[PDB]
DNA sequence: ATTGTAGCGGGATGTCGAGTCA
DNA sequence: TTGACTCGACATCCCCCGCTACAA
């Protein structure tokens, strides 16, 4: 009855770790390759692939009455380039193994054992390769970017990083063998974007695999489709590297549903993640912001607002902007005079429809005690927003954030006396709750210290522990003392062995 | 905190042979436990490290 | 005798894989 | 074809200052 293909939270958490680790390496590999592309020795040889006529096409004169025709000439150039690169590149290899396509966790684990066969590359062999025109499809595009760059076009290298899927919870994760290679190579890992100064948009160019040039609006030929093609290519992080060592996450261009579908598969979905990802992207972005950056962000913004409510219930779990009436938490209510921002047709029941709210119209409520733990209490005459069932049986009243106000604890005396509770401590669940003329000192021995100096203090209860029994117990993490006394306490703490 | 012989293999796999990342990263993460919280906290460090090298 | 020491969370919500239904 | 829904066993996220009894 139970086949149950699932791994341990340990393995989960490792996969998450390994996903990040594998990813950073991938994104650095991009960074470096994108360098090697700018190679000046290489550039000078590749220029000669490109006729003056074509060169001129790549740099059309501004046509003011109709910019469109300038884009048109630029496009003609990019196609004449795509053609002569087909010609430059004589011998096009197959990937040994999976190239930079996504691997299955099992495959990884097993890759330890067979250490297989790995030539070594470095920078020369790459350059030499691109010049003879010998290499796999990844190399071929990279060269193409070199060539364009050597023609002084602003030509990004795009990399769709395929680290292993950290949302794959499965123990055995097995793939279909049929047409496996033909289906993996169906869509590219690397490709090129090119900036049109006339239409102020980035042009998409895949000169080697799909061999088309597209101006992406809502849909892109490069984004993989169909269950089979996506086992090995799961579009999550599409990174753009430019001449000047920009690094920009351009996934939104290529992802039709970035905010429902693709976001569930990026490390970027919890808050720590976004923040981690940005650190990495920032590590990789060695230039300062251009106006192009803004034309793009403007594109992205518009892309991002045309996505809208998704067309299915599975896609509204944990959506950034949107939530179903049914998923509004017990502790949430709808902000007054708001209502649905949209409806959802429910696939497979006729006429059955759901109410979708904007997450911005939903309020989070907390009980009185709950607020206190954010260092806030109820403003005078506050009406409760909602009532629920707690556990024995009791009804717990909840309040909005604006029903409430900071708790300003009383200042300490001249002698540095701190005002206490029934148990002889002071409650600090938030910096706010540290008195103004006082500081919090957290340290297992701060109480030993303060007691030894016999200066006036008060224990900090900063949280509670929960354990067997229905018991709760306070956590004393430290001391609250007048600031003048801080220097003294810190010294005693430092000297605790001498007490 | 990390060796210089592995930092060599790691610069090279990452730069010219990323196909081989998979087993290298399997090996090395198993030989350097602490790397984990490093990578979670301060990725920008680990990055920078791979660029000089 | 008396004191110290040791023994007695959980409930809503959420997550992913699979199988079943239409 | 594919999504909605159910069901199996995990996870997270707040709860938010105790008591009965034995023994040297």
Author numbering:
A (entry chain A): 126 to 516, 525 to 632
B (entry chain X): 256 to 308
The authors write:
The mammalian global genome nucleotide excision repair (NER) factor, xeroderma pigmentosum C (XPC)–RAD23B complex (hereafter XPC), in particular, faces a difficult challenge. Once bound to a lesion, XPC recruits the multi-subunit transcription factor IIH (TFIIH) that verifies the lesion, which ultimately coordinates the assembly of NER factors, causing excision of a lesion-containing single-stranded DNA and repair synthesis that restores the duplex. The previous crystal structures of the yeast XPC orthologue, Rad4, bound to model lesions have shown that Rad4 and, by analogy, XPC recognize the damaged DNA site by inserting a β-hairpin into DNA duplex and flipping out damage-containing nucleotide pairs to form an ‘open’ conformation. In this conformation, Rad4 interacts exclusively with the two nucleotides on the undamaged strand without making specific contacts with the two damaged residues of the model UV lesion.
